[PDB]
Design a protein around this nucleic acid. Sequence first.
RNA 1: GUAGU
Length: 96
Amino acid sequence: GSHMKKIFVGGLSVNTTVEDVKHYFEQFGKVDDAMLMFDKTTNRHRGFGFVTFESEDIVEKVCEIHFHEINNKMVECKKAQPKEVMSPTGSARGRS
RNA sequence: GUAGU
């Protein structure tokens, strides 16, 4: 459909872990899992990742806040787009 | 080191 039962999280500090994110988002409702975009060329993440949920009612609750705060830095939370947007027509953070 | 593994 139009969205996954998962959020995008962008602007993450280099100090912030996948477990920091997974334990943080649990304040709104139950978290299924989390992942950050790791690069083996440096062993750091690409400054963004994803968080999967128990319910899309939490995905909405979290996305309505839009700007969150982790390790004394701010992060942007958005609905995870359905991977078709990884095409060169949408990979520049685009929408249909 | 803000649009995927």
